[PDB]
Swiss-Prot record:
Superkingdom of the source species: Eukaryota
Residues that, per the record, bind ATP: 18-26, 41, 93-95, 99, 159
Induction summary: Up-regulated following treatment with IFNG/IFN-gamma.
Function, as annotated: Calcium/calmodulin-dependent serine/threonine kinase involved in multiple cellular signaling pathways that trigger cell survival, apoptosis, and autophagy. Regulates both type I apoptotic and type II autophagic cell deaths signal, depending on the cellular setting. The former is caspase-dependent, while the latter is caspase-independent and is characterized by the accumulation of autophagic vesicles. Phosphorylates PIN1 resulting in inhibition of its catalytic activity, nuclear localization, and cellular function. Phosphorylates TPM1, enhancing stress fiber formation in endothelial cells. Isoform 2 cannot induce apoptosis but can induce membrane blebbing.
Full protein segment contained here: 2 to 277 of 1430
PTM summary: Ubiquitinated by the BCR(KLHL20) E3 ubiquitin ligase complex, leading to its degradation by the proteasome. Removal of the C-terminal tail of isoform 2 (corresponding to amino acids 296-337 of isoform 2) by proteolytic cleavage stimulates maximally its membrane-blebbing function.
Family to which this protein belongs: Belongs to the protein kinase superfamily. CAMK Ser/Thr protein kinase family. DAP kinase subfamily.
Domain Protein kinase: 12-273
Active-site residues per Swiss-Prot or TrEMBL entry: D137 (proton acceptor)
Origin organism lineage: Eukaryota, Metazoa, Chordata, Craniata, Vertebrata
Protein name: Death-associated protein kinase 1
Record's subunit section: Interacts with KLHL20. Interacts (via death domain) with MAPK1 and MAPK3. Interacts with MAP1B (via N-terminus). Interacts with PRKD1 in an oxidative stress-regulated manner. Interacts with PIN1, PDCD6, BECN1, TSC2 and STX1A. Interacts (via kinase domain) with DAPK3 (via kinase domain). Interacts with GRINB. Interacts (via death domain) with UNC5B (via death domain). Interacts with UNC5C (via death domain).
């Protein structure tokens, strides 16, 4: 599938850089014809078939195809796609309130504050999983706010770079997400489905309530070993005034066997969440 090959700079003006990763940089932008503001994600293309730098066209097209399907208040939406010899440029909805992570470092949240964010995350993931889309990269860095200055901001899931359609219940590919947040089946290179996202939500919830990462070791291999062994506990110093039901919610997500893990629908009916 081909994208718009006119020069993006003839239609948009770029501004402040919002972030940069291994093969992508995100810049605030403004469409000349409407004055509307977006985030332009420049993804570096692979320049030879056998190279390991840049993103393969198969991977770029998959992310674009997934973004084109989704429209939900808690998920980023795609406006336009351009390309040239060096980059594919996704013109994405502007989410300017910063990461849930950076907003986390400023505060540990109360259970009402945590559940207010978490309910929006669960709503967005319920939408995705209803479409058989696994995100595969849920972590605080990929949870951003629209306006961080209100007592209860609205969040949006971003970064569909690892997302996959799961039309056979599982997909057998390597997902190189970040160790602290990936499920045991990712660590062990096993078939992957929607369940992996639910584990990631359990990790996010643990951090939201405590400010601490449940599996984090001193090295990436330690973290991955801890994940595979389900080597975590609720430290009383961090959880002493956290409700048992909040702990129960986490405990039913941080489950090694994906079949025994709470699903997205389970998580919405769990007594900690269900109104
Ligand atoms: C903040 O740090 C980072 C943010 C982003 C992405 C920001 C962003 C992404 C979108 O898809 C839409 C948007 O409005 C903003 C990428 C790498 C980073 O390191």
């Amino acid at each position: 599938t081909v994208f718009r090959q006119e020069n993006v700079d003839d239609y948009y003006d770029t501004g402040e850089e919002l972030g940069s990763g291994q093969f992508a940089v995100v810049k605030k932008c403004r469409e000349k014809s409407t004055g509307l503001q977006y985030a332009a994600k420049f993804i570096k293309k692979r320049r030879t078939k056998s190279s390991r730098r840049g993103v393969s066209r198969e991977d770029i097209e998959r992310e674009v195809s997934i973004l084109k399907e989704i429209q939900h208040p808690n998920v980023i939406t795609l406006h336009e796609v351009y390309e040239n010899k060096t980059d594919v440029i996704l013109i994405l909805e502007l989410v300017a309130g910063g990461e849930l992570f950076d907003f986390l470092a400023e505060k540990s949240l109360t259970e009402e504050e945590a559940t207010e964010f978490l309910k929006q995350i669960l709503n967005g993931v319920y939408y995705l999983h209803s479409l058989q889309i696994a995100h595969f990269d849920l972590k605080p860095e990929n949870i951003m706010l629209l306006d961080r200055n209100v007592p209860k901001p609205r969040i949006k899931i971003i970064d569909f770079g690892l997302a996959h359609k799961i039309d056979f219940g599982n997909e057998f590919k390597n997902i190189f997400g970040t160790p602290e947040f990936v499920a045991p089946e990712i660590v062990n290179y096993e078939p992957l489905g929607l369940e992996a996202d639910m584990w990631s939500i359990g990790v996010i919830t643990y951090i939201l309530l405590s400010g601490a990462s449940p599996f984090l070791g001193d090295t990436k291999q330690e973290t991955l070993a801890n994940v595979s062994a389900v080597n975590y506990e609720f430290e009383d110093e961090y959880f002493s005034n956290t409700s048992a039901l909040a702990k129960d919610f986490i405990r039913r997500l941080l489950v090694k066997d994906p079949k025994k893990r709470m699903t997205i629908q389970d998580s919405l009916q769990h007594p900690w969440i269900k109104p």
